[PDB]
Amino acid sequence: LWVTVYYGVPVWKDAETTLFCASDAKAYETEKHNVWATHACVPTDPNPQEIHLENVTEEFNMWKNNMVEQMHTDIISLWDQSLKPCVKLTPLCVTLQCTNVTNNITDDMRGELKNCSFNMTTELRDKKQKVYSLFYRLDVVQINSNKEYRLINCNTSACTQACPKVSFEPIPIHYCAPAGFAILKCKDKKFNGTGPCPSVSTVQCTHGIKPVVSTQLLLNGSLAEEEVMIRSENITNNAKNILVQFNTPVQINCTRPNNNTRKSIRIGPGQAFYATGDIIGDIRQAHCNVSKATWNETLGKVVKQLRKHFGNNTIIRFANSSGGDLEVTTHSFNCGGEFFYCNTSGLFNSTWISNNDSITLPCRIKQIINMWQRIGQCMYAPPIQGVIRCVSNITGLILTRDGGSTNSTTETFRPGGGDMRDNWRSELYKYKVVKIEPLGVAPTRCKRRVGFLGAAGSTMGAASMTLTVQARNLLSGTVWGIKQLQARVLAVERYLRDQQLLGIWGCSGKLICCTNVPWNSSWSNRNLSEIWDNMTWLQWDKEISNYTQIIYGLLEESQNQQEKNEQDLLALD
Amino acid sequence: LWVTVYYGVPVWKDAETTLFCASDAKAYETEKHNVWATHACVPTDPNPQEIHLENVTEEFNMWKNNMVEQMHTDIISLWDQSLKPCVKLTPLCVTLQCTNVTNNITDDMRGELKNCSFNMTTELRDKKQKVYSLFYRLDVVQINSNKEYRLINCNTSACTQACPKVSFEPIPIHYCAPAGFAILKCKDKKFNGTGPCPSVSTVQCTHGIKPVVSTQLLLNGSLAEEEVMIRSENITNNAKNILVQFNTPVQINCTRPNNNTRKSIRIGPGQAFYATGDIIGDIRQAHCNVSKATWNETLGKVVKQLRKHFGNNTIIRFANSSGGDLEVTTHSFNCGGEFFYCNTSGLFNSTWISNNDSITLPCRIKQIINMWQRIGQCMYAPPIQGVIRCVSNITGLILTRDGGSTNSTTETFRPGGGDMRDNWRSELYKYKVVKIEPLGVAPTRCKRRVGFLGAAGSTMGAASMTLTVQARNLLSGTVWGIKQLQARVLAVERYLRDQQLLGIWGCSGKLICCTNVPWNSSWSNRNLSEIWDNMTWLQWDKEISNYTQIIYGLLEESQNQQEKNEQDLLALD
Amino acid sequence: LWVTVYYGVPVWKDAETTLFCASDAKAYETEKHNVWATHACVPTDPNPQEIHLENVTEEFNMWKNNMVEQMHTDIISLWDQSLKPCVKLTPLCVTLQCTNVTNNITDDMRGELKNCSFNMTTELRDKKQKVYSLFYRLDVVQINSNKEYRLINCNTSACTQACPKVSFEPIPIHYCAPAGFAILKCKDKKFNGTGPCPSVSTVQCTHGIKPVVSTQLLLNGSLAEEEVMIRSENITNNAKNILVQFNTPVQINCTRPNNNTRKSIRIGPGQAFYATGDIIGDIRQAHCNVSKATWNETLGKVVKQLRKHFGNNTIIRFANSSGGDLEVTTHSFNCGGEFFYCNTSGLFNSTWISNNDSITLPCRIKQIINMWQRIGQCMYAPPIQGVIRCVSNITGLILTRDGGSTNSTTETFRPGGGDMRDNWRSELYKYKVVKIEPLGVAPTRCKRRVGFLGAAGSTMGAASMTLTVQARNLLSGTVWGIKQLQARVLAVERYLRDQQLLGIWGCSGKLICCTNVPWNSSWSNRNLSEIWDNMTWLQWDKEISNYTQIIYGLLEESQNQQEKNEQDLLALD
Ligand SMILES: *[C@@H]1O[C@H](CO)[C@@H](O[C@@H]2O[C@H](CO)[C@@H](O[C@@H]3O[C@H](CO)[C@@H](O)[C@H](O)[C@@H]3O)[C@H](O)[C@H]2NC(C)=O)[C@H](O)[C@H]1NC(C)=O
Ligand SMILES: *[C@@H]1O[C@H](CO)[C@@H](O[C@@H]2O[C@H](CO)[C@@H](O)[C@H](O)[C@H]2NC(C)=O)[C@H](O)[C@H]1NC(C)=O
Ligand SMILES: *[C@@H]1O[C@H](CO)[C@@H](O[C@@H]2O[C@H](CO)[C@@H](O)[C@H](O)[C@H]2NC(C)=O)[C@H](O)[C@H]1NC(C)=O
Ligand SMILES: *[C@@H]1O[C@H](CO)[C@@H](O[C@@H]2O[C@H](CO)[C@@H](O)[C@H](O)[C@H]2NC(C)=O)[C@H](O)[C@H]1NC(C)=O
Ligand SMILES: *[C@@H]1O[C@H](CO)[C@@H](O[C@@H]2O[C@H](CO)[C@@H](O)[C@H](O)[C@H]2NC(C)=O)[C@H](O)[C@H]1NC(C)=O
Ligand SMILES: *[C@@H]1O[C@H](CO)[C@@H](O[C@@H]2O[C@H](CO)[C@@H](O)[C@H](O)[C@H]2NC(C)=O)[C@H](O)[C@H]1NC(C)=O
Ligand SMILES: *[C@@H]1O[C@H](CO)[C@@H](O[C@@H]2O[C@H](CO)[C@@H](O)[C@H](O)[C@H]2NC(C)=O)[C@H](O)[C@H]1NC(C)=O
Ligand SMILES: *[C@@H]1O[C@H](CO)[C@@H](O)[C@H](O)[C@H]1NC(C)=O
Ligand SMILES: *[C@@H]1O[C@H](CO)[C@@H](O)[C@H](O)[C@H]1NC(C)=O
Ligand SMILES: *[C@@H]1O[C@H](CO)[C@@H](O)[C@H](O)[C@H]1NC(C)=O
């Protein structure tokens, strides 16, 4: 009959907000190399809390998530911030004099290293300096008695050498939302990227996400749980990348067996340039090894789950990439500072039908890079002395279907990728951000006299006793610097708005503040047995969400003001 | 009689604060390249509300407004931000060797364009490049086989090319104040600039203001109603500009018949310099057209209002600009990218005794500009390819009077301008920012036991029923980015201070409350019928403004502390 | 028996927070623009409030004061900010060719002023310029038939010319604590800098302190009272400085008799380089003067007050500095823009046994400078034309004890300094920041039915009637603005946390409230009369902070939740 206002109901709606980084601050409390990304984040909770929701079935969507875009923008801005402070190599674009290096009489790499020598400025503007350095063939381009060259990007973009002190080591970060927002987590083991997730769990924020950069194979990412899953925006469409994820890792070992040496040239006053001085001992190519039997078994599995969608009689035949830029055409990870670019033509060999030492990947290195498909600004990665070795493990792939015929007697899958959002979407697949609103109104028989969300799936009557748990922690009282400020300002304003709305009414209280506005039959007149015993809060929100504004207006104006002026006139005499 | 505290009365008072931007969704969603000003402006509400205050009369002042200065600072800051991130053109200073253009036939514009050639640097620091470009006569100065010149600014300032993609296209901007403030709006049809406006209305924020930059003639402005209103700070003083506002607009057309060509010179790495390569076909001077009959009629209408201020039978005479810099001597503006500088001696030339064709304005174009009289921050607008044409309205003038004696036989009005504040002040003449304060105290016979401003003109008895409406909107739950954040924080702060000051008294959760403070007769006591039925809250607060601190001190000391301590002593048994 | 929560109670504890500047408007209104970026600082309070606290004893310490480090960081940041828009002199690193003092007659100083002639780029790229300048012997280092030199730091740092408009003139800076905090001012006459101060006071803003710079002598410092004070972290440790603060000042006059003239050389466009053109008249030595009798008397006082720690009849000896950099070896300072560097060996040249016109100190001047022992950043102070004279007051030394022994026979003292924290620490020795904690709990017999800090020393019974004054003040109503914004948001967040924590309990009504938690005897049981009337509020915080968290837990969980769970039954009707 009479309206009653409830504060702290289990209700949420989809929204987007400014997330802030959290990371393990104890590891870097003792200072180390100034990492590219992870600094100034709030310390992470030593005991993260994950709460399971009893009966809810939330709808997820991988390919229209906003956290991926926020992550990509954050990484781009962090990289741009990192590159700015240190040296600019504007005076290095000069005509070079380059000849082939003479290794320690070992062949098959003779044409790849140059010994460019050139003129460079010095401290005093009136004088010039004569220097030399070693450049890779992919870094230096010809300009048309030994022939003379220039750097590759002199006619496109400038160069800012990376600050030698920082380190491009990926290390995990946690994206945490402001107070008043919650991040759901799809939990079932067969989530194909879209559709309902019958198992859901609320977490304050995420686990450790390593911002690894790669094009053709995903490295160090999170594995699947039950089986190797295949995800795509629309599998039937050939234009959409077919992300894949493994359940057991395939180990890849990469090396640069050259005893490189750094050599600093001054281009001062103050500024210095680090050249590739000289290589000691033999010179050999950089190669990556992947176990043959393990890779064969992994592909023989992926083809098995891949035939679930494309029929169980078709012929599946992998192949190397079609072509394009060197980033797209070759697996382009980074290992300790050097930016490899490796072939992968030996991996994607097979032709499957219904019925042992290693695989070597010969490859090459480039020092100058302009990643994220950008133009107008490049970077010069300084050389790293000594042999460098990495042991990653392949966790997923990025496939693309040819779709070259309509009969569909066979299918051909060439690996691709290069849009860095695909790497992030492979990790943020089981998250979304929701906006908790704690206020609610429902009819009852009042007349006023003169887990964190574990009750979400329960009926409205069952959830009418746990109101306090929602409202207890509603406030929870340079990149990563302004984001925290905006996040906490938004949280404070949300708490203040909720308190003001609950205060202008007659309630000023937490649990079950009865009111006096009569229940109009126009606001979905149902039997109270059909309301309290049948429905739940999330369902109760939807049909009445049109009329919440009218009920708020009636409570604030029609009832409280008249009631209080009546009390004031009562105390007159 | 005892004091009673009301929260959310219609009281306001004049104040100055920080405003933020807001733009239309159409301009917000324009996929093309960003406009010079609006990038992070929040989208505007599709339906702003007008809450005409009914019986209120407020004192307006056009000249001493603070919105104008804030707009000027914001515009200058936006320009400086716009020019920072693209090409700097320091190495263009070279001794240029120039020669006249050959024209086509029947030479008429010989001395304006020069065919300058100079040696310019290329990407490779070793080599040099021979190029040529066409510079207008106003952009070069001779130095002492053919003659040689330098650029205009290479002994005062360093050039900086305007970014080639961004366009200085004026578009509407709305300046909206944060929560807890209001922007009143005068609507008197004959508002001359100062004095009380008997018809006052409040909007959430202003109408669309086009930030057009021009001098000597206001373009694309807002027109008056029923009269050709004329405004000035002081008509007797001859050192003050006399703004005008036409009833109906005057159509002005402008053209640049030369068919330019954009020649790209690469002076990298990365940078570039766009040059006026060569002109195709016939070559002629830029000119602007204004209808003769319309302009004659408009002058004949404006002189009638000048006769009112300066008396009947006085002869009003017009004359062209007094002389000085080219910025103020000629009607300067930009039409699609080219900065025109048009002679206006054909318009301001007439004499008016007591009792079909088109006018052609010769015009000249300049490329190197240092607008806003800020020497040291020059700019080089790149050439715009193809014929340029635009059609605009003239909706105002900026006249100045001649002060040679008075002996009022006649007056001589000469156009002026140059200070850009007058362009903004012509649009923001019907607004001012007033901060709303909700708290208030008034007497009555009660003692305690032991539209958004539509009621601003109503009596205190009727106004006390609308405390909810006033009290609701006190939170409303790059340069613009920090403006919005600071304004939001300020609003939250003011609301929290109001809440705390209400809470130290015994009236925390209530809009109205009775208190046991006696009403001292020294506070201008009056019969209740003369307060609650013969006064309004704005008029009441104007009377008790001296005793507010004493009453607040009494309420916080004599009542709450003593009451709580005595109640604590009572609860012991 | 029962617990009762008190809000707004005079209790504080040590804490650190970012402070904000406050300077008078006259400094900005001075014609010398941007002397210290006064626009950043807030206008000063016209009447700072000092409230005497009558019974409080507080533990002071200056050797761990955080305000010293905050002032140092603020000064460094302001200095770096000031020079950013100024000219950069990278093209000045040229092979100079210098030949002593050929243009003038000089006394026996001989080769201190080098007459340097060298090439330079004119306002145009094409043509070079032949110019000259006078550089001091300290500003040029030889490089290997007239000899040739270069500037001192052409292989270390890039000079940036000081802007000529601004001047490095110190002005008062007032430090004001943000909302919620307070600054305690110790007023004891004989305060050593450590231990309990029995005459504490409080101030909203500190007294005006001038950020002077000088190594071996403190200039314009604040004077002590009634005796020369000696302060040290541990006097018997040889490695720690021993500050001194004279009772009465010793005046020092300094002069630059050379009559310099400024020559403006153009490095255009938009850049100028001010050289030392020529010296009119005879070359003469720069020197400083100190009164002999006054200085001898001051050292006679310092020995009297410094033998107190060491011995009544121990030999104490003074001596000049040992060696090292010119900054530490010699008393440096600025005198009207010229950075003097004067040896003080004519002053510390005394020996004192167990039981006549003026001291003159000739000294040098250096132009290129980089204070704080910084590397990578430098400045070139332009010449100050005309004869220069200064007058200053010495107000404290910075001594240092030698580690040799002679365990008791003799003690040797030398001037020290070099780190600029000591100069700030000599002025902020009587101020520390404290954080106010307004919540408090005390036992009493109440059971619930089913100046700003002048009372900090008074008993709890009397201090319960002044809860309003503390509670009222807690809220207190581009680059470098985010610091103030973050401090402000932090204050708001702290207030909201306190209010929410009070709201979880059954005490939404502010100030003295009562709760039903019994008072366990284990929590420092005392008879009630000796709790309320034989003890103060600060001492109560020193005997509950162990159990305060558990008391808050009992209040928030054990009583209010059960009360609501009992109330829900009666809420149905
Ligand atoms: C006053 O407002 C008028 C709006 O009518 C301004 O004229 C407009 O100027 C723009 C920019 O030149 C014109 O758009 C351009 O059109 C050309 C094609 O001619 C196109 O190639 C460009 O990319 C751009 O879209 C626009 O057509 C023109 N308006 C009209 C009706 O022609 C005028 O510039 C304003 N006054 C001042 C002083 O800015
Ligand atoms: C997924 O992509 C496929 C493209 O193959 C879409 O299927 C096409 O739909 C159009 C429109 O009806 C037909 O003309 C084509 O013949 C279809 N192609 C095939 C191979 O069947 C499909 O609609 C897309 N799915 C979604 C949900 O967008
Ligand atoms: C990729 O696959 C092709 C065939 O699919 C491989 O070519 C085979 O090489 C072996 C070894 O000489 C021959 O015995 C076969 O006859 C070849 N097959 C065909 C169809 O000609 C090729 O070597 C593979 N390359 C890599 C790098 O894995
Ligand atoms: C200044 O004199 C005081 C004694 O009056 C010394 O301070 C004492 O220091 C000890 C050591 O920490 C403390 O336990 C005492 O409480 C302090 N008492 C007082 C009154 O401050 C201090 O050491 C002297 N300073 C110097 C530099 O010698
Ligand atoms: C102050 O400094 C002195 C000297 O540095 C310290 O005294 C020394 O203490 C060690 C440890 O017992 C002895 O081995 C030395 O012989 C002492 N030297 C002298 C000269 O006394 C003293 O401990 C320091 N005091 C404080 C409070 O730090
Ligand atoms: C610093 O200079 C001042 C003058 O500007 C000196 O003060 C003067 O000294 C002379 C000689 O003793 C007196 O005749 C004047 O009356 C003094 N003038 C004033 C205003 O006091 C001062 O002695 C100099 N100090 C030093 C250390 O040389
Ligand atoms: C400051 O003055 C003293 C005293 O004149 C200078 O000390 C000289 O030191 C050198 C090296 O031992 C010797 O010439 C003498 O011992 C001292 N000179 C005289 C005349 O006795 C000191 O060099 C001066 N400071 C500077 C930076 O030169
Ligand atoms: C505008 O009108 C007011 C009267 O309301 C008058 O005081 C003022 O001088 C007028 N100003 C002008 C410029 O006409
Ligand atoms: C007293 O109140 C009456 C209301 O009926 C009013 O008419 C009268 O003017 C008042 N007199 C004074 C002195 O305020
Ligand atoms: C400059 O003066 C110094 C000091 O007397 C002297 O050693 C030097 O030889 C002089 N320079 C020349 C060029 O004579």
Coordinates of C-alpha atoms in Angstrom, one line a residue, chain B residues 92-208:
Chain B
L92 CA 63.7 29.1 -42.7
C93 CA 65.5 32.4 -42.1
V94 CA 67.8 32.6 -45.1
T95 CA 68.8 35.6 -47.3
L96 CA 66.1 35.2 -49.9
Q97 CA 66.7 36.3 -53.5
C98 CA 63.3 37.5 -54.8
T99 CA 61.9 38.8 -58.1
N100 CA 58.5 40.1 -59.2
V101 CA 55.8 37.9 -60.6
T102 CA 55.1 38.0 -64.3
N103 CA 51.3 38.4 -64.2
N104 CA 49.3 37.6 -67.3
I105 CA 48.2 40.9 -69.0
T106 CA 47.1 44.4 -68.2
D107 CA 49.2 44.6 -65.0
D108 CA 47.3 45.7 -61.9
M109 CA 48.9 43.9 -58.9
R110 CA 52.6 43.9 -59.6
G111 CA 54.1 44.9 -56.3
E112 CA 52.3 42.4 -54.0
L113 CA 53.7 38.9 -54.8
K114 CA 57.4 38.1 -54.9
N115 CA 59.1 35.0 -56.3
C116 CA 61.6 34.2 -53.6
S117 CA 64.4 31.5 -53.8
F118 CA 66.6 30.3 -51.0
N119 CA 68.9 27.4 -49.9
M120 CA 67.1 25.2 -47.4
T121 CA 68.3 22.2 -45.4
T122 CA 67.3 18.6 -46.1
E123 CA 67.1 15.6 -43.9
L124 CA 70.8 14.6 -44.3
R125 CA 72.8 17.2 -42.4
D126 CA 75.6 17.0 -45.1
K127 CA 73.5 18.2 -48.1
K128 CA 71.6 21.3 -49.0
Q129 CA 68.5 21.9 -51.1
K130 CA 67.6 24.6 -53.6
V131 CA 63.9 25.6 -53.5
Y132 CA 61.6 28.5 -54.2
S133 CA 58.3 29.9 -53.0
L134 CA 56.0 32.8 -53.4
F135 CA 55.8 35.3 -50.6
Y136 CA 53.5 38.3 -50.3
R137 CA 55.1 41.7 -50.0
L138 CA 54.0 42.1 -46.4
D139 CA 56.0 39.0 -45.4
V140 CA 59.4 40.2 -46.6
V141 CA 61.7 43.1 -45.9
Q142 CA 64.7 44.3 -47.9
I143 CA 68.2 44.2 -46.6
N144 CA 71.1 46.5 -47.7
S145 CA 72.1 40.7 -59.1
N146 CA 68.5 41.4 -58.2
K147 CA 67.5 42.5 -54.7
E148 CA 67.4 40.2 -51.7
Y149 CA 65.1 40.0 -48.7
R150 CA 64.5 38.2 -45.4
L151 CA 61.3 37.2 -43.6
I152 CA 59.4 39.9 -41.6
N153 CA 59.9 38.3 -38.2
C154 CA 63.6 37.1 -38.3
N155 CA 64.8 40.0 -36.0
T156 CA 61.9 39.8 -33.4
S157 CA 60.5 36.3 -33.0
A158 CA 60.8 32.7 -34.2
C159 CA 58.2 31.2 -36.5
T160 CA 56.0 28.2 -35.8
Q161 CA 53.8 26.8 -38.6
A162 CA 50.1 26.4 -37.9
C163 CA 49.4 22.7 -37.9
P164 CA 48.2 21.7 -41.4
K165 CA 45.3 19.5 -40.3
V166 CA 43.6 21.5 -37.5
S167 CA 41.3 24.2 -38.8
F168 CA 40.5 27.5 -37.0
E169 CA 36.8 27.2 -37.8
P170 CA 34.6 29.0 -35.2
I171 CA 31.8 26.8 -33.8
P172 CA 29.3 27.3 -30.9
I173 CA 30.6 26.9 -27.3
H174 CA 28.6 26.9 -24.1
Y175 CA 30.1 28.1 -20.8
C176 CA 28.4 26.2 -18.0
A177 CA 29.0 26.8 -14.3
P178 CA 29.4 23.9 -11.8
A179 CA 26.8 22.6 -9.4
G180 CA 25.8 25.1 -6.7
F181 CA 26.0 28.1 -9.1
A182 CA 23.5 29.8 -11.5
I183 CA 23.9 31.9 -14.6
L184 CA 21.2 34.5 -14.7
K185 CA 20.0 35.9 -18.0
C186 CA 18.5 39.4 -18.7
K187 CA 15.7 39.5 -21.3
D188 CA 14.7 43.2 -21.4
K189 CA 14.2 44.0 -25.0
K190 CA 15.8 47.5 -24.6
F191 CA 18.7 46.5 -22.2
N192 CA 21.3 49.2 -22.9
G193 CA 24.1 47.5 -20.9
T194 CA 23.8 48.5 -17.3
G195 CA 21.2 49.2 -14.7
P196 CA 18.5 46.9 -13.4
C197 CA 17.0 44.4 -15.8
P198 CA 13.3 44.0 -14.8
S199 CA 13.0 40.6 -16.7
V200 CA 15.5 38.1 -15.3
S201 CA 15.7 34.4 -16.2
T202 CA 18.1 31.6 -15.2
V203 CA 19.4 28.9 -17.6
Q204 CA 21.7 26.1 -16.7
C205 CA 24.3 27.7 -19.1
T206 CA 24.6 30.0 -22.0
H207 CA 23.6 29.8 -25.6
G208 CA 26.0 28.9 -28.4

